Symmetry: D2
Subunit: 122 residues, 4 copies
């Protein structure tokens, strides 16, 4: 699924995920969020199963963005965990954890959870 | 926190996280899980806030492991999202999402969630 | 939103959530899952914000099902946390945690996470 | 585990969970949070597995608090999902989802996730 995953993806929020899948299991690219304390592109890196089951199962993958670039620093990081599903309407279905840096007193309230679905068309 | 993060960390399960933090926000290393469908080391990559707040807040970070190496393929990936807290007893406090590849029918049951705390001593 | 919430709801899996919202903030009803180790109806109870903001915000709510009834016992419980959104296409948008009973050794793998969206039509 | 669960529990934040477990699987009680937009006691309800496995597994359970009482309304609800572990140092180990009411535009940022461990001594 190197070919299937590599490319430009869009989620339901209007965010843009640009990724290259390497033969070895690497994910590298950029992410641009349509929402939040974010502007322009941010580095992302991650990993995917480069030899997935051939029983029609999805391909497990995940990636991280730290929300610091040359424009802004939101002192936070999001990780997406999910699976790539190939076919006519390819999809990456994810759930995510967004942690922001906090004091120890506020650590209980440091992590948001959500879900994003990416497609190859906006 | 490049110096603070780089090194060998251990969680409550007895897993070993070996990481290098780059000046640019990169995380690269290996992970060895004490539990699950896992043996020996797996590649990890991730990101951290390389210019965190100086108000005593933690440093946000995250990373991904795809559970394929030369020994096993568990057709799954975990992402950890959390913060590094420096000091005498440094800690990385995380929550994680483990997704495994599934059929579309079983996708509702594809993702485990948990929490790991890493310290510099086992 | 007592009137808005009370009734029969369906999610994307084909599950059926039958709920009564009380004036005091109570949720009581039954849940029937289309998937998993489940058959027929299970008791549910929960709570909702009975005086929500009137700035167009959703109404926060949550509920629990333990997966034991007269037919089956899956030694597990799910909680849904989410918000009710009123209007022509009313929705309850949720994320959920499903914990199953485990040994202490397997507790790291005890909890699934997902997301369900309920509507008033299947 | 009716007897084991019923009583007063405390988490790592200093919150107080007061619960009665019914023979039928009901949980009913009050919760007082040491943190957040909260004061005094809030109603809780939930469910537990009233016939758990006898292979040394934990007992699955969950409960909900809507954060409205006579003092405050935080327009939010938390659900805890977890398992009760009996013995000399009884514990309830949970993960939780806290959703607050939002506009549709801000729904992506509506849900916090965390983990609480309750014991019978503070
Ligand atoms: Ir395989
Ligand atoms: Ir999903
Ligand atoms: Ir959704
Ligand atoms: Ir700052
Ligand atoms: Ir935590
Ligand atoms: Ir813990
Ligand atoms: Ir209000
Ligand atoms: Ir959602
Ligand atoms: Ir969805
Ligand atoms: Ir059993
Ligand atoms: Ir846990
Ligand atoms: Ir913890």
């Amino acid at each position: 699924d190197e070919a299937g995953i590599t490319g430009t993806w869009y989620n339901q929020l209007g965010s843009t995920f640009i990724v290259t899948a390497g033969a070895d299991g690497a994910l590298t690219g950029t992410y641009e969020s349509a929402v939040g304390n974010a502007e322009s592109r941010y580095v992302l890196t991650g990993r995917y199963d480069s030899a997935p089951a051939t029983d029609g199962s999805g391909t497990a993958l995940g990636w991280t963005v730290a929300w610091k670039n040359n424009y802004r620093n939101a002192h936070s990081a999001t990780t997406w965990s999910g699976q790539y599903v190939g076919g006519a309407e390819a999809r990456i279905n994810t759930q995510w954890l967004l942690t922001y840096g906090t004091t120890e007193a506020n650590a209980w309230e440091s992590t948001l959870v959500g879900h994003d679905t990416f497609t190859k068309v906006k």
